Amino acid sequence: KDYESLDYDRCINDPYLEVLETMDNKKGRRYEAVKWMVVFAIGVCTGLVGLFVDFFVRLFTQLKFGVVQTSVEECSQKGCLALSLLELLGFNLTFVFLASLLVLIEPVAAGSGIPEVKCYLNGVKVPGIVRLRTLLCKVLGVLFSVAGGLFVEKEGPMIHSGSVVGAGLPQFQFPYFRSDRDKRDFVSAGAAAGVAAAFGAPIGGTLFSLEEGSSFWNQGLTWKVLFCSMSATFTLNFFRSGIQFGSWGSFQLPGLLNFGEFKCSDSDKKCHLWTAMDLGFFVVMGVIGGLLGATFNCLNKRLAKYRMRNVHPKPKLVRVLESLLVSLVTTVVVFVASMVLGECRQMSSIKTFFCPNDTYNDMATLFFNPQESAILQLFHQDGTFSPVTLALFFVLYFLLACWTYGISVPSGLFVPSLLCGAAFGRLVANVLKSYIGLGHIYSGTFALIGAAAFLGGVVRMTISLTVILIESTNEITYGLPIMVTLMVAKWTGDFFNKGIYDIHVGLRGVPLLEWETEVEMDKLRASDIMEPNLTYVYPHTRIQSLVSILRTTVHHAFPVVTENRGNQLISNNIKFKKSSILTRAGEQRKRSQSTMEERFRPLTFHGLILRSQLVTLLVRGVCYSESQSSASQPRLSYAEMAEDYPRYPDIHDLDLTLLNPRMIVDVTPYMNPSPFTVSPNTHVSQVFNLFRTMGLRHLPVVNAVGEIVGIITRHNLTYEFLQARLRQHYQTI
Amino acid sequence: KDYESLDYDRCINDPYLEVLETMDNKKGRRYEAVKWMVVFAIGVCTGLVGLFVDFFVRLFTQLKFGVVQTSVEECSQKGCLALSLLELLGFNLTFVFLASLLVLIEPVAAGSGIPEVKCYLNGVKVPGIVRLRTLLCKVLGVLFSVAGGLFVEKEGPMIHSGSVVGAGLPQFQFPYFRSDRDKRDFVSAGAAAGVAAAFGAPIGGTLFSLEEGSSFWNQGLTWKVLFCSMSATFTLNFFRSGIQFGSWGSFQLPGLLNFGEFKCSDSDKKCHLWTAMDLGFFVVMGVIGGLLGATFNCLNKRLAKYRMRNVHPKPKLVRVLESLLVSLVTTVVVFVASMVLGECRQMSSIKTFFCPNDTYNDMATLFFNPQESAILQLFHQDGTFSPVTLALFFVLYFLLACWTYGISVPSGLFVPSLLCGAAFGRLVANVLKSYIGLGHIYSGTFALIGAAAFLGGVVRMTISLTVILIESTNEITYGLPIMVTLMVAKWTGDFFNKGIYDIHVGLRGVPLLEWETEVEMDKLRASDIMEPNLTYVYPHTRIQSLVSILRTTVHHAFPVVTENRGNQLISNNIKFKKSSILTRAGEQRKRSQSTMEERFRPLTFHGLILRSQLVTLLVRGVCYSESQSSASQPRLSYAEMAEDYPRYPDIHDLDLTLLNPRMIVDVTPYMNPSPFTVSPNTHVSQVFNLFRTMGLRHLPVVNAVGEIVGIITRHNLTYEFLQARLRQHYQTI
Ligand SMILES: [Cl-]
Ligand SMILES: [Cl-]
Ligand SMILES: [Cl-]
Ligand SMILES: [Cl-]
């Protein structure tokens, strides 16, 4: 497939120069005020979306459990036990069917949002990740999917929902924020707001949006996304603490996922959250979690390849039956595990099913209760669960989560991977309690460290994940035990496989730029990765040549150049070549006054022109006759160019009958005179640093004599291409 | 004055190419392991430095108070009251005299460290901010100064101490970390570790080190400075909780400054930390704090100008008497205010002086106790202080702190400005309690918001300050009230004056690059700010010309160029000019095979050469005779060049008698062939973005025909120069 990258690099021409000349300091102040207002509105809307999801998820799950529990009781009295299972299966099948249909409406809504958000912040523009229909389909699918008990999450897709809101909202409201730079900034702000609403950590969201889109440090935009995040996480709170509780002005609880309070349960001699002796246990748990994450990634990748090979090339009826099958299998498994193998233990959140008086079923309590309740019980309750219960729950949940993720329904991954780790940590703590005394430390710390290790194994994130976990825990003293677990579980896992998101984005074939290049990559030069073949546009060019090159070629940008070695066309080109050059003596005076050879020809680089501007010029009557001088021109303004910005007409779409051939079109005013260039003798690391951090596109390579020698595109800087070229370079010598 | 900037931009030549060719993947892994070890060692050493400061500060202050309190009692019994004052004055004078002498040893140790650290991370290299003597003098001065009761802090200079440790330590231990890039990275890590040790907030330190040195996002170095910060803040804890308390494995308290625990004092109906109705109070307190900060900055700037005009041009005897005078004045004032105007209130930390039975003096309790104890009492004690006490303490402390800062002794600023705000907030809370019921909210919140507002007014920091305050508070729910106070007190203050650090760095005359440029600055072009005059070096140049240009000129870099329009010299230059050019046809074939006019002359740009490399070449026997070809050359290796890295000999220092004139020196191998260049038609914003974020130096401007037209240096991008050039541009038209 082929994808269109974002045009993040700024383009400055005469219309923009006129707008800048008209611009004044008061206008700049008004612009900044409007930008602040838009940021605040984005935060508020993301908070409202989170509230809308959470309220209906809770309502549906509570109603479903209310219908079944009584039926469980009556059908257990006589011993039928069937109607309880039949009603549960009916509810699950209905919800999963609705979610599958909704995903069938919009294909990109499937799976977690993060794989399709790391690409937009990197500038790949997956074809359907901004459209409002995607937002509606995903937000409706998430509530239906989790209500069906598919072992999924809600905190995942909230990032994509916030990203869509941030991308869309400013467009609805000197055109305002038409350039792709502003769109990318607002997408970053929306992603940060979504992360804050999901996890309750504002600084974690700011740091997540800082990376995954790594550009030059923009002090003044980070200060805006932090405000957006703070507003987003304190609007969800203001309503979720006013609906659940009675007080309205109170801010009693952070966003969707909260771990609780980490303190010694009772005033006890020598009770601490953690001590220096536990560090070995933390390291061992980290490496175990890394191995488990590697196994999870391996099985998930194999399953994804199998589905991509067989299931996808099937009619629309298939890919809908698979979700129903997995929902049925998981419902049957959870019901059987609640009925049998669940140890009844002597005693509102706790559910007692199939169990005698004054006793509760731990398996049922873990499986039925919503994931937040299960997490809270695993962290802050001691002695409630037997080790066999924990082992069975961990194995079943791990296998079912590994099998489930990837199917059509809008799954999540943070919670179902945050739940197995807690169970493993609690099991480890229970084992350690028997052999040695554990009174000197808290019990829930092991569960927290296990959860952190499993996340580190599965997703393999850094910096952002550490901050998110620390600010969710609400205890800064957990800074060290968590981090030394994230940096170990990662290092253990990188031996076997990459992260889930990297695996699922490499399957799509999307080209992604890595963070840094190896030293062997630096050994290469820039002359080895450029593309010697070029498509060029002369200034004052023929309209027939323009339409021919636009129809024949697929490149999105053309270097406007002049030959180095119609009569009016040639005369105008020579006049421009003499007018454009500026010598140092001239500048000082101004200050004081106050075959293959034909194919590969020397050309002097003058600028870059985008395909969109050429199409816009062709659509309008932008041309002059050969007899007439180039002075006469429509001279379109900025607003006229931006009028067609959201949707750019295709060249084949245009009728093109009106256009008169043998007509000269001037592209000098509308081109980008000064793009970032680089000498062919430069090394790969500098080129990669520029092309990544500056976020630009189509980096031209020009030699010492001003001859343009090549163009570098993102396809030339992927890891596979660099590795292949390095292997070829070793093969040459 | 003139200052030498850091050479952050990487230089790649043939010795480095040889080292890279010898380099292997295993060697890279070993390099990364060594770098991690160095980072951890830096963190540990910074923690140890913090512990060393804190322990002796506590010991000295406790001993001084132990000597005086008994003498206070006996001399009060008869009514003399003199010996108590005499002993206090003697102690204060001795400590302040020692601190003043120690600062007299090293001039740069004076004042807070931050003004001299913002310059190094920006690349200015203040002449004495890395030397170990500065570290020793500052660390010894801080403990003596605060023990004298000069109304100063300890958290300020810890940043400079960590920076010095990070700069120095790797040098003590393929040369390792010789390039200035590694030195700057380690300085950033040391600054982050120092901030973490001072305030107990690791992420705050990471974010402080991220800004103030804004460069391209380096994922893989942030992940190292975060580890350094975490290790630094958890080594100070491990010892300060094992010395003060009894348990050794326990981590009971964060770094030097801790705010405590923010919870409702008793289980009470409708008790919350804060509610939505308080936001107006927070905004009003923020604007009041902004006005107060503006006043503080105004008076401090006027006093600093007065001292710079009169006090500084004086012999060394002066500038030592001023510190003694201020110490005497503050001791007399504090003793008198403790004796009189301190209201005795009915009842170990609390001090009862000059007061009858079962009563304590609030003035004495606030003034005598260490600043941490005063802060803790102001935050978490209600009803202890009368409003008159608070007003008098605030006024006196504000005036004395404004007068004190700037003198020789190593003062701090965070604590003395964090203490007035707390008093103001407590006074506001006490006033509000009388008029309206305040039972619905906590009392200390007003003190915290007042402190945050006063810091925002005085220092005017963002992002970093917010995170530092949030992670010191240990309550994420304070995210919004703090931040909406920082962003208001800043906006209120920016009307009148800049921050303290900006004022004190603008007085030194140091050129600093601002974060962003205005749109009017973008209206300017690059041709208007470049310097048309150049000093150039031909390849294969005469040694006499080299020595003449090195002695005559002061520029630190020379563009190696060739004329565009000895016989052996000219022949070699022409041969190099033909050998260097690479045409696109040639590259494709290679792949397939597999007066004033004399003064201002057209020159083709070939590279950049630093003065240091030229001096190194001159020191060694790097030359060849005219008859001999250029093939023969000593061909120095990387280690030989780096051997002289720490100290570069001056040209005037060299005897130069051995050097034989009329001898050709080849500089082609040792130059930087591919520096970042920019076209003269580019706009100012792009140039500023490159020259800032890439951290480079001496950005060359070359036109379309390859002619070099100018050089841009940091002196051309300061705010004053840009404003002057913009005014001139308006004047022209
Ligand atoms: Cl999630
Ligand atoms: Cl996810
Ligand atoms: Cl301080
Ligand atoms: Cl300071």
Q: Where are the alpha helices (DSSP H) in B405-499?
A: 414-435, 444-458, 464-473, 479-493
Task: Output the DSSP codes for A112-181.
Answer: -SHHHHHHHHHT---TTSS-HHHHHHHHHHHHHHHHTT-S--STTHHHHHHHHHHHHHHHH---SS-SHH
Which residues are A541's β-sheet partners?
A: A665
Contact between residue B542 and residue B572 where contact means Cβ atoms under 8 Å apart: no
Gap from CA of B157 to ligand 3 centroid (Å): 7
| Cα A159 to averaged position of ligand 1 atoms, centre (Å) | 9
Window 615-674 of A: residues touching B by CB (8 A cutoff) are: 673-674
Q: Which residues contact A253 (CB under 8 A, 6 or more apart)?
A: A237, A240, A241, A244
Asked whether the beta carbons of residue A707 and residue B584 sit closer than 8 angstroms, the reply is yes
Longest pairwise C-alpha distance within chain B:
107
Task: Say how far apart CA B139 and CA A286 lie, in whole Å.
Answer: 39
Nearest by CB to A532, from B274, B587, B605: name it: B587
CB A526 within 8 A of CB A578: no
Cα distance between residue A506 and residue B392, in whole Å: 67
Contact yes or no for A632/A621 (Cβ under 8 A): no
Q: B40 forms bridges with which residues in the sheet?
A: none
Domain covering A276-316+371-506, topology: Clc chloride channel (1.10.3080)
Beta-ladder partners of A558 = A609
The answer to whether A594 and B692 have CB atoms below 8 angstroms apart is: no
Q: What is the DSSP letter of B683?
A: B
**CA B679 to CA B699: how far, in whole Å?**
11
Residues of chain B neighbouring A732 (CB-CB closer than 8 A)? 594
How many other C-beta atoms lie within 10 A of the C-beta of residue B263?
12
CA angle (B336 as vertex; B332, B340 as ends), nearest 5: 175
CA distance B139 to B52: 9
Resolution rounded to one decimal, in angstroms? 3.5
**Are the C-beta atoms of residues B421 and B114 closer than 8 Å to each other?**
no
The three-point CA angle B518-B522-B523 to 5° equals: 115
**Which residue's entry shows tokens 């200015």?**
B124
**What's the A293 CA to ligand 2 centre distance in angstroms?**
15
Beta partners for residue A345, in sequence order: A360
Measured in degrees and rounded to the nearest 5, phi and psi for residue B75 equal: -70, -20
Chain mean position to CA B222: 18
The residues pairing with A624 across neighbouring beta strands, listed in sequence order, are: A664
**Looking at this protein, which amino acid is placed at residue B461?**
M
**Exposed, middle or buried, B501 (CB in 10 Å: 0-12/13-18/19+)?**
buried
CA dihedral B657, B658, B664, B667 (to 10 degrees): -100
| CB-CB neighbors (< 8 A) of A587 in chain B | 527, 532, 680, 709-710
**Of A202, A211, A704, which has the smallest distance from its Cβ to B706's Cβ?**
A704
CA distance B371 to A108: 58
Q: How far apart are CA B219 and CA A462, in angstroms?
A: 10
β-partners of residue B31 are: none
Q: Which amino acid is at A438?
A: L
Which one of the ligands is nearest to B414 CA? 3
DSSP H or E run through A345: strand A344-346
| Annotation: CATH topology of B276-506 | Clc chloride channel (1.10.3080)
Cβ-contact B307, B410 below 8 angstroms: no
Cα(A636) to centroid(ligand 4), Å: 54
| CA A642/CA A639 separation, integer angstroms | 5
Alpha carbon distance B32, B51 (integer Å):
29
Rounded-to-integer distance, Cα B402 and Cα B404, Å: 6
**Which residues are paired to B664 by β-bridges?**
B542, B624
User: Does CATH place domain A28-59+109-135+150-243 in 1.10.1660.10?
Assistant: no
Strand partners, B609: B558
Contact A159, A188 (CB under 8 A): no
Across-strand partners of A542?
A664
Closest by CA to A421, choosing from A395, A453, A397, is A453
Question: Residues of B within the annotated binding site?
Answer: 112, 414, 501, 555-557, 713-716
Q: Dig out the tokens for A163 from the structure.
A: 């990203």
Q: Which residues of A touch B580 (CB under 8 A)?
A: 704
Nearest CB among A214, A532, A732 relative to B219 is that of: A214
Do the beta carbons of residue A134 and residue A164 sit within 8 Å?
yes
Contact B137, B109 (CB under 8 A): yes
Q: What distance, in Å, lies between the first and last C-alpha atoms of chain A?
A: 34
Rg (CA), chain A: 30
Residue from the list A222, A274, A683 with its beta carbon closest to the beta carbon of B12: A683
Measured in angstroms, the CA of B190 and the nearest CA of chain A are apart by 18
> Which residues of chain A have a CB within 8 Å of the CB of B470?
203
Query: Closest-lying ligand to the alpha carbon of B198?
Result: 3
Mutation pick from A476, A517, A690 vs chain B, by most beta carbons of B within 10 Å, is: A476
Grouping H, G, I as helix, E, B as strand and the rest as coil, residue A322 is helix
Residues making up the binding site of A for chloride: 112, 414, 501
- Tell which CATH architecture fits domain B519-732: Roll (3.10)
- Distance in angstroms (rounded) separating the CA atoms of residues B710 and B533: 7
- B476, B512, B533: best to mutate for the A interface, most A CBs within 10 A: B476
Cβ-nearest to B249 among A230, A276, A604: A276
Q: Tell me the domain boundaries of chain A.
A: 28-59+109-135+150-243, 276-316+371-506, 519-732
Q: Between chains, do A463 and B222 touch, taking CB under 8 Å as contact?
A: yes
What is the phi/psi pair of residue B519, to 5°? Answer: -65, -35
CB A664 within 8 A of CB A626: yes
> Any CB–CB contact under 8 A between A487 and chain B?
yes
Which long-range contacts (C-beta less than 8 Å, at least 24 apart) are formed by A354-359?
A354/A72, A354/A76
Instruction: Report how far apart, in Å, the C-alpha atoms of B731 and of each of A26, A170, B726, B727 are.
Output: 21, 39, 9, 6
Length of chain B, in residues: 733
In the reported structure, the alpha carbon of residue A115 is separated from the centroid of ligand 2 by a whole-number distance in angstroms of 8
**Ligand nearest to the CA of residue A461, numbered in listed order:** 2
Residue found by looking up tokens 């001056």 in the block: B650
Within 10 Å of residue B189's Cβ, how many Cβ atoms? 32
> Ligand 3 centre from A135 Cα, in Å?
48
Chain B residue nearest residue A277, CA to CA: B249
Integer Cα distance of A395 and B728 in angstroms: 75
Cα(A662)–Cα(A678) distance, integer angstroms: 36
Interface of A with B in 467-486 (CB under 8 A): 467, 470-471, 474-477, 479-480, 483
Q: Which residues of chain A does B518 touch, with a Cβ-Cβ cutoff of 8 Å?
A: 25, 28
Measured in whole angstroms, the distance separating CA B66 from the mean position of its chain's CA atoms is 37
> Are A488 and A454 contacting, i.e. CB atoms less than 8 angstroms apart?
no
A607 by DSSP, 3-state: which?
strand
> What is the Cα–Cα distance from A684 to A519, expressed in whole angstroms?
10
Angle at B15 between CA B14 and CA B18, to 5 degrees: 85
| Spacing of C-alpha B598 from chain mean position | 46
For residue A658, how far is its CA from the centre of ligand 1 (angstroms)? 54
How remote is the CA of residue B112 from the centroid of ligand 3, in Å? Answer: 8
B604 contacts A597? CB cut-off 8 A:
no
**Is residue A136 within 8 Å of A108, Cβ to Cβ?**
no
Sign of CA dihedral B400, B401, B405, B408: positive
For B621, the token pair is 């026997």
Q: Following DSSP, what letter does each residue of B139-178 receive, concatenated?
A: HHHHHHHHHTT-S--STTHHHHHHHHHHHHHHHH---SS-
- Select the residue of A476, A588, A597 nearest B585 (Cβ to Cβ): A597
Q: Contact, A157 vs A138, CB < 8 A?
A: yes
Contact A520 B25 (CB under 8 A): yes
Q: Are A611 and A557 in contact (CB under 8 A)?
A: yes
- Rounded to the nearest 10°, the torsion over CA A466, A471, A474, A475 is 40
HSE at residue A438, side-chain half, CA atoms within 13 A, is 20
Strands (DSSP E) contained in B289-390 are: 344-346, 359-361
Give SS3 for B567. Answer: helix
Separation in Å, CA A282 to CA A38, A375, B225, B456: 44, 20, 22, 40
* Superfamily holding B33-239: Clc chloride channel (1.10.3080.10)
Are the Cβ atoms of A25 and B520 closer than 8 angstroms? yes
Give the contacts of B395 (CB within 8 A, at least 6 positions apart).
none
Instruction: Please judge whether B480 and A518 are an interchain contact, meaning their C-beta atoms are less than 8 angstroms apart.
Output: no
Same fold, B33-239 and B276-506: yes
Q: B200 with B177: CB under 8 angstroms?
A: no
Q: Where on the phi/psi map is residue B588: left (φ > 0), alpha (ψ -120 to 50), or beta?
A: alpha
Question: A709: nearest CA in chain B?
Answer: B584
Name the residues around ion ligand 3, CB cutoff 5 A. B 153, 155-156, 412, 414-415
Structure tokens at A421: 């780790």
Q: How far apart are CA A540 and CA B31, in angstroms?
A: 55
| Chain B nearest-CA residue for A696 | B686
Candidates B274, B704, B708; nearest CB to A581: B704
Chain B residues in contact with A272 by the CB 8 A cut-off are 249-251
CA of residue A141 to ligand 1 center, whole Å: 14
The b-or-e profile of A665-680 (16+ CB within 10 A means b, else e) is bbbbebbbbbbbbbbb
Alpha helix (H) ranges present in A413-463? 414-435, 444-458
Between residues 512 and 531 of chain A, which touch chain B (CB distance below 8 Å)? 515-516, 518-520, 522-523, 527
Of B276, B277, B582, the CB nearest to A703: B582
Which single residue is written with the structure tokens 């009675």?
A: A246
